[PDB]
Design a protein around this ligand. Structure first.
Ligand SMILES: Nc1ncnc2c1ncn2[C@@H]1O[C@H](COP(=O)(O)OP(=O)(O)O)[C@@H](O)[C@H]1O
Ligand SMILES: Nc1ncnc2c1ncn2[C@@H]1O[C@H](COP(=O)(O)OP(=O)(O)O)[C@@H](O)[C@H]1O
Lengths: 365, 356
């Protein structure tokens, strides 16, 4: 009577046990399959993203909105409506005709980690090894993330360090192929329309001039041509330069010139990686005033283009023209007090988004 | 023993609490992670079409065949490749220079030609219609180009294989696709089922739920069971052919893809249309000339397009629309007797670029 009752219940529960374990097994089998498919999908989606951006041409504009830090709680924060992964719109908390919705190549949410940011940039660096000039720029008001995105903090490294390792990994496989790539370095700081070499602590006078090789590229003199040795050597040179830099509103122009040496045949790759940390979008515009003019130039002007008025724009004269992938980070603060400046940064980003197609060279001489 | 089974029950009730909490956790990981797989694959599909758009929706290609050793003694003409997109023939006795989206010389393998088509099979799975053509004089390679040969299969066999392998993959995204094939043929502006041995009349009407879609009556529409099926089917398609006289007959294969996601209650339907155009030689005189009026017409963005003027332009109409992608292979004989006709072919290809 009792011994009957409870021995049935035992069996009944053995049924929920093996059912809740059967369903528990297949859930994990689907779940493992779903994530891989989701990775594979994200892979083929970022592939086509690079593949589309490529055909549109050679100027890319990414927009990264910074999250309020632990110091911003009651600070007024403008409304932010993310319509797509490439289209975003900001709204003034107060009252309100103008452009408020903005579409770029890729818009990064505050949540996006430094890894995701560099994940989209990675293809360009890799392209520099196959003979290609690359230039990365960080525009925006101060506090928006220009240092955070371009460079990186200790915990989350930025684009600058992330490329270092990525570049040496590729170099490793290329040495094996017989391609002995050589990495060089050039760190300089146009603080106030004056170049100041960050690798050379001794004061010098850089002078930007039509690169003697060809009118197409434009080199610079009095600059420490430091031949990089390994990932951490460059991490040493990174530290070196930030030391000299110390800054808030200055153009830190880094030029990791990338050469190649193939044992199969005397060919040489060209990798003009140009990681530039602009600063000061808000109105004081020392060199950044002419940056908006070369940009508005490439939109209107064709062959004719202002090349001076900004040491920065004269260094970048290889890019503006052609054979150079240009990518600009639009770091923008999410606060209502900076709502107008944020719009200003997004207006410049829209003109950058509307810039002309630049060609590309095999750069394999 | 009563205390023994009184304990087991108490163990079994825990291990089923934890197993109930464990299954509750898994299912919410699956829920959002299928949401992501869907949204991710959805931005994927969007990008792919944009890529496909930049490359062009209507691309034109050129494939001069290698001279057969049967004809090693038949004399060639002077072919000059000005780039990989451009070509020019000259008569061995004004200039004749032609530009393409891509040109295929006589060592271009069958695989090199499918590489142009391969991306489209993904767009047929994405719900866009797709159109594939083998324009050229008889002996150009039209048949060799699409159907292929046993050692090196053509575009149609490569499609099938890629089609099934995608479908198997897709099934992990939750879509379940189905393939319905209509092997038919147009002669003297009248259609014929190739899968049927009896002779039944067929006509082009509107589809039950779409006026733009095309419906053919009393055709066969075999639903494909596995490649083995698709093999038998395609075999049986070569039958009921004969008048040997495929020179004046348009061989239309149409693999309709019918993808349905139950979870999200969403459908994807794309139609592939691999057409083996009849010989372009001046003695179907209607369907051929018409199909090329329409294609030009499309390029020039005319308001109205005489889709009904031809059985072929009528039958293919839902795959000639803007969102729909079309690839045109001009096969050409590299010989001196073929010269004049090979020019006509290429000249039409100039027409296309000119209307753009
Ligand atoms: N996505 C992010 N996640 C975490 N912290 C961020 C993010 N973006 C910016 N920050 C932080 O906010 C500040 C960004 O300002 P910063 O980049 O230093 O000024 P500037 O824009 O002049 O270089 C830094 O403290 C940086 O650590
Ligand atoms: N790449 C190629 N390699 C070998 N043979 C080819 C090639 N292209 C065309 N041919 C030859 O030309 C013919 C192709 O068939 P074709 O006569 O153009 O088609 P249709 O039967 O539709 O008129 C066959 O003789 C084939 O052997």
């Amino acid at each position: 009577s009792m011994h009957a009752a409870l021995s049935t219940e035992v069996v009944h529960l053995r049924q929920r046990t093996e059912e809740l374990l059967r369903c528990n097994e297949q859930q994990a089998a689907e779940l493992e399959t779903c994530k891989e498919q989701l990775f594979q999908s994200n892979m083929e989606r970022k592939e086509l993203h690079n593949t589309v951006m490529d055909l549109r041409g050679n100027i890319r504009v990414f927009c990264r909105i910074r999250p309020p830090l632990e110091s911003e709680e009651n600070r007024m924060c403008c409304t932010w409506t993310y319509h797509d992964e490439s289209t975003v719109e900001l709204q003034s908390i107060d009252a309100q005709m103008g452009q408020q919705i903005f579409s770029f190549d890729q818009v990064f949410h505050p949540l996006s980690s430094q890894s995701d940011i560099f994940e989209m940039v990675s293809p360009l660096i890799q392209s520099a090894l196959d003979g290609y000039n690359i230039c990365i720029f960080a525009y925006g008001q101060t506090g928006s993330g220009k240092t955070y995105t371009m460079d990186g903090v200790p915990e989350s490294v930025g684009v600058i360090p992330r490329t270092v390792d990525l570049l040496f990994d590729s170099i490793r496989g290329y040495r094996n192929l017989g391609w002995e790539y050589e990495i060089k370095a050039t760190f300089l700081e146009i603080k106030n329309e004056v170049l100041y070499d960050l690798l050379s602590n001794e004061q010098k006078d850089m002078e930007i001039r039509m690169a003697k090789n060809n009118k197409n590229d434009i080199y610079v003199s009095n600059i420490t041509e430091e031949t990089v040795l390994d990932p951490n050597h460059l991490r040493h040179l990174m530290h070196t330069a930030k030391m000299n830099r110390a800054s808030s509103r200055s153009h830190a122009v880094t030029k990791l010139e990338l050469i190649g040496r193939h044992a199969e045949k005397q060919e040489i790759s060209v990798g003009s990686i140009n990681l530039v940390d602009l600063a000061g979008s808000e109105s004081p515009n020392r060199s950044l005033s002419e940056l908006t003019n070369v940009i508005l130039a490439l939109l209107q002007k064709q062959d004719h283009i202002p090349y001076r008025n900004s040491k920065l724009t004269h260094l970048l004269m290889p890019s503006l023209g052609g054979n150079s992938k240009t990518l600009m980070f639009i770091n923008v603060s999410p606060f209502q007090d900076c709502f107008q400046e944020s719009v200003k940064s997004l207006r410049f980003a829209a003109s950058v988004n509307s810039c002309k197609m630049t060609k590309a060279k095999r750069n394999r001489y």
